[PDB]
């Protein structure tokens, strides 16, 4: 129940592109984890997966609370914590994670509304910290250049 202070600057386009350039590279990430559409702009931070304008729509219906959707080419006002969620997840990660439990469900309003799915989301939040906390904003990867102030 901690509101959370605000003493840091949001990630710029470049930085955001750097976090997506690494995830996109992957063949299982550059394809809508749902159908497999290549260059899946749409991305779901909740499950840190890649979706396509087609599928992404379904998620939006569920409710930003159930599955938040954010583009990569347009949406630039991303949150450090979020961005990571994508790196600390991946498509395959879920493709298996789910089965491991035994979802045996395809439906979007069900497969995602199932326990197996939930477990994932939470997990993403945790890991996201490992990367986020790391040198706070300073892109763990390397020193991009801290702006005076
Ligand atoms: Zn799709």
UniProtKB/Swiss-Prot annotation:
Widely expressed. Highest expression in endocrine glands (pancreas, pituitary gland, salivary gland, and prostate) and testis with a much higher expression in the testis than in the ovary. It is found in: Cytoplasm; Golgi apparatus membrane. Residues 17-133 form the Arf-GAP domain. A zinc finger (C4-type) spans 32-55. Signal peptide: none annotated. GTPase-activating protein (GAP) for ADP ribosylation factor 1 (ARF1). Hydrolysis of ARF1-bound GTP may lead to dissociation of coatomer from Golgi-derived membranes to allow fusion with target membranes. This is ADP-ribosylation factor GTPase-activating protein 3. The lineage of its organism: Eukaryota, Metazoa, Chordata, Craniata, Vertebrata. The gene is ARFGAP3.
């Amino acid at each position: 129940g901690s509101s959370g202070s605000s003493g840091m600057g949001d990630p710029s386009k470049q930085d955001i592109l750097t976090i997506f350039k690494r995830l996109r590279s992957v063949p299982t990430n550059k394809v809508c984890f749902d159908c497999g559409a290549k260059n899946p702009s749409w991305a779901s931070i909740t499950y840190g997966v890649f979706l396509c304008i087609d599928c992404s729509g379904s998620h939006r219906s569920l409710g930003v609370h159930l599955s938040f959707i954010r583009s990569t080419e347009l949406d630039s006002n991303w949150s450090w914590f979020q961005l990571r969620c994508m790196q600390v997840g991946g498509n395959a990660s879920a493709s298996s994670f789910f089965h491991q439990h035994g979802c045996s469900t395809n439906d979007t309003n069900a497969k995602y509304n199932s326990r197996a799915a939930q477990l994932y989301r939470e997990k993403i939040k945790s890991l996201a910290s490992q990367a986020t906390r790391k040198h706070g904003t300073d892109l763990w990867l390397d020193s991009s250049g801290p702006s005076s102030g």
